[PDB]
Chains A and B, each alone.
Chain A
Amino acid sequence: KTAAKLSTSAKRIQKELAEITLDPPPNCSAGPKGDNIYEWRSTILGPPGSVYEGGVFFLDITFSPDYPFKPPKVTFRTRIYHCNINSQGVICLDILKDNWSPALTISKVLLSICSLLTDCNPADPLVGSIATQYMTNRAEHDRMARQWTKRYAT
């Protein structure tokens, strides 16, 4: 029925599950929520030294039957004050749009997201007002991001 690319996607996710359990990226874990291999949950710790330090953030991860030839859908389920992550939890990250590659892995995705928490990209903002504040009133941006981290992510 050629829906058998379910087999392709499931084999790849099954191997990645094993590898991300034995060798998780620093300060991240991820795994299936339940019986559906295509629907994972993930925890990210706020990178040390960043305004998100001490935060615990939850992400949803949904693989498509086309995986790994189409990117997974990854959305933040914890509120975070960050110009590339909006209140829908949409993440503005190139490798999740048209820079996706089938050689990427969910571990690589989580590492990029951690890198994005460490260094936001205000040239490609999802929350314009946060990007503008980040560039013109850096200290105000960091004060509020630390307050969000404390109230919403601990």
Chain B
Amino acid sequence: RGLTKEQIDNLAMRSFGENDALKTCSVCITEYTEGNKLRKLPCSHEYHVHCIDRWLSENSTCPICRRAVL
């Protein structure tokens, strides 16, 4: 099982900033573009909001390092 909508909304969220232009969301294999919103997990791995929210709806760990998010 995955995370409640409340736990998910409690995770960090920031707008794209120019330094993110060089980074790639591992879930959609796409470089961040302006307007995007990025979520940064406790283990410090970052994703598009819609990308990791979709995964955390039915799962509980980081796509990259498999550490528990909570």
Most chain B CB within 10 A, of A8, A19, A105, is at A8
Measured between C-beta atoms, what is the minimum distance from A98 to chain B in Å? 10
Do the beta carbons of B63 and A101 come within 8 Å of each other?
A: yes
Tell me how many residues of B have a C-beta within 8 Å of chain A.
Answer: 12
Do the beta carbons of B27 and A16 come within 8 Å of each other?
A: no
Q: B residues within 8 A CB of A11?
A: 28
CA distance A12 to B55 in the complex (A): 15
- A103-B28 contact, Cβ under 8 Å, with A69-B54, A69-B55: no
Contact of A68 with B by CB under 8 A = yes
Contact of B64 with A by CB under 8 A = yes
Q: B residues within 8 A CB of A1?
A: none
Looking at chain B's contact residues, is the secondary structure mostly helix, strand, loop, or mixed? loop
Q: B residues within 8 A CB of A8?
A: 28
A99 nearest CB neighbor, chain B only: B66
Q: A residues within 8 A CB of B64?
A: 101, 103
Do the beta carbons of A12 and B29 come within 8 Å of each other?
A: yes
Measured between C-beta atoms, what is the minimum distance from B9 to chain A in Å? 19
CA distance A73 to B51 in the complex (A): 21
B57 nearest CB neighbor, chain A only: A69
A70 nearest CB neighbor, chain B only: B58
Residues of A that sit less than 8 Å from B by CB: 8, 11-12, 15-16, 19, 68-69, 101-103, 105
